[PDB]
């Protein structure tokens, strides 16, 4: 009862058959979730659309992922991945930002329990690739406790609304290193031209930052 089900795709698939010619079946993609980090998806196939709904939703409940959420509202860090030809770039956002993501991602995020996130989908916009690409990226996100344990250092959060106050979000359970993390004068990290073009005011789009209903 704690799980809700949402439809993501309903397709009519047409099979050429040896004796009966073109036959019509239904392929359904549905996602399930309880809104508290546990969510999954499954494909359903049947001749009838309502039998496919039963198969997909019942199967998905046995293939649940657990998704870690920062402060139970957003992701722990920016997630950028490619699944086949579908690129998904997700950004961690503060409270009140809402879900500004592909309508399918909005649907899935409400099932997982993410309230604030930005996501951009590029390349092929294939619902199935997007669903499993989204679940692969959200299930492989490192939490702050894992980062502290991996590096044996404190994780300190700096918020501009709280000024210079250092907020320790995670501390290593094991011993605490004494050697500071090396300060590479310039990081060799790859940047996204879309993100950079936005910060430099060179991104012009009539469709970006449009007023939309609460999501």
């Amino acid at each position: 009862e704690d799980f809700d089900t949402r439809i993501l795709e309903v397709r009519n698939v047409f099979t050429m058959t040896a004796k009966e010619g073109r036959k019509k079946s239904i392929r359904v993609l549905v996602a399930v979730g309880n809104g508290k980090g546990a969510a999954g998806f499954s494909i359903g196939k049947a001749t009838d659309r309502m039998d496919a709904f039963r198969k997909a939703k019942n199967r998905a409940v046995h293939h649940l992922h657990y998704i870690e959420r920062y402060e139970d509202h957003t992701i722990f860090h920016d997630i950028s991945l490619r699944f086949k030809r579908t690129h998904i770039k997700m950004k961690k956002q503060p409270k009140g930002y809402g879900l500004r993501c592909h309508r399918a991602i909005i649907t899935i995020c409400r099932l997982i329990g993410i309230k604030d996130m930005y996501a951009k989908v590029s390349g092929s916009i294939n619902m199935l690739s997007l669903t499993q690409g989204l679940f692969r990226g959200l299930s492989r996100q490192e939490t702050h406790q894992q980062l502290a344990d991996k590096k044996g250092l404190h994780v300190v959060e700096i918020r501009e609304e709280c000024g210079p106050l250092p907020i320790v979000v995670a501390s290593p359970r094991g011993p605490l290193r004494k050697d500071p993390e090396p300060e590479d004068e310039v990081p060799d990290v790859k940047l996204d031209w879309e993100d950079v073009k936005t910060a430099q005011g060179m991104k012009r789009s009539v469709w970006s930052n449009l007023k939309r209903a609460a999501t």
Binding site: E1, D4, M50, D51, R54
Partner: peptide
């Protein structure tokens, strides 16, 4: 929550 028709009658079994 919403309604999908029930799949079958359990008595229709061995």
């Amino acid at each position: 929550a919403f309604v999908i028709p029930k799949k079958n009658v359990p008595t229709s079994k061995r």
